[PDB]
């Protein structure tokens, strides 16, 4: 399948223990893809004062489409030194590894794979 129904849990930023997926664009997007089907992925919704607390290269997901049964669209964009390896709409939150935090919430996403 093009696309896979996902649910990810979201993450406060201070519970996070691994806060980011390597340390090249093509690392961190690879790791995230793996992490995303093997279900171990949490999502953290960015605010003020939350990206200088992880780690870059960061894994965003972005909005690819204006909703099939709640899951909204998404694609994954990558960022370096302030360079984006991709092109898509707004964010949704940047991603990270899931070793067993608990989260706030869940968001239900439609993965472009």
């Given at each position: 399948?093009?696309?896979?129904?996902?649910?990810?849990?979201?993450?406060?930023?201070r519970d996070v223990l691994v806060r980011g997926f390597g340390?090249?664009?093509?690392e961190v997007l690879s790791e995230a893809?793996?992490?995303?089907?093997?279900?171990?992925?949490?999502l953290v919704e960015v605010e003020k004062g939350v990206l200088p607390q992880l780690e870059q290269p960061y894994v965003f997901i972005?909005?690819?489409?204006?909703?099939p049964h709640g899951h909204v669209?998404?694609?994954?964009?990558?960022?370096?030194?302030g360079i984006q390896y991709g092109?898509?709409?707004?964010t949704l939150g940047v991603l990270v590894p899931h070793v067993g935090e608990i989260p706030v919430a869940y968001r239900k996403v439609l993965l472009r794979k």
């Open positions: 399948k093009t696309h896979v129904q996902l649910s990810l849990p979201v993450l406060q930023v340390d090249s664009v093509e893809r793996q992490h995303l089907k093997d279900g171990t992925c949490g972005k909005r690819s489409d204006a909703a669209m998404v694609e994954l964009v990558a960022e370096l030194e092109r898509s709409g707004e």
